Amino acid sequence: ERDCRVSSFRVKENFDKARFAGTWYAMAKKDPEGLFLQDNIVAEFSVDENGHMSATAKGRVRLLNNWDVCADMVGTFTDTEDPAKFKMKYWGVASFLQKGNDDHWIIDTDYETFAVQYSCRLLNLDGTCADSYSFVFARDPSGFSPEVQKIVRQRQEELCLARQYRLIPHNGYCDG
Numbered sequence: 001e002r003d004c005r006v007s008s009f010r011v012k013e014n015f016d017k018a019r020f021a022g023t024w025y026a027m028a029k030k031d032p033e034g035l036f037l038q039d040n041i042v043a044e045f046s047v048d049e050n051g052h053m054s055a056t057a058k059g060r061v062r063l064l065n066n067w068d069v070c071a072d073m074v075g076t077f078t079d080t081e082d083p084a085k086f087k088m089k090y091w092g093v094a095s096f097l098q099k100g101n102d103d104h105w106i107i108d109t110d111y112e113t114f115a116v117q118y119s120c121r122l123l124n125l126d127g128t129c130a131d132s133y134s135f136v137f138a139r140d141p142s143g144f145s146p147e148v149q150k151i152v153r154q155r156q157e158e159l160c161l162a163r164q165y166r167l168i169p170h171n172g173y174c175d176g
């Protein structure tokens, strides 16, 4: 039944950049292949006068050589024909941190409690996703109500990502 094609995934209706501004604590995540942020992830979103969205993010990353580093990351977003789908250019303040460009979609959000984000980095020949990442954010570091948890589980299912997220710890590693 349900369609796993990236192109059929619903997104946030009439997304509002200005209401999305602010601090968002990552609560759970579904990792992509390769190096990614491990934990202690906190993102901060901003929208200037011209409507240009940007964000800064802090998170712990395990370098291949076993060092643990706190990554200071920056991302700028470009608008598209869909208010909830953006192209994200990102880079770190330290030269060794990953740089790239990645789609950034806002699956769902109430602006005040939770948000579900999603990025497909590589499409299969059938249109499904072969390499994705998804974050579940909260406005409160204490998490969500059971009521909101139900909604979030729903969205995970529609991303065909159910049963594949892991809880993310916050223990002050990058100053929390």
Ligand SMILES: C/C=C(C)/C=C/C=C(C)/C=C/C1=C(C)CCCC1(C)C
Pocket: 035, 036, 037, 043, 044, 055, 056, 057, 061, 071, 073, 074, 075, 090, 091, 097, 098, 117
């Ligand atoms: C080794 C360093 C690694 C992998 C860093 C990866 C950082 C990455 C995914 C950052 C993504 C985000 C940015 C910039 C802005 C806010 C939201 C996101 C979606 C949190």
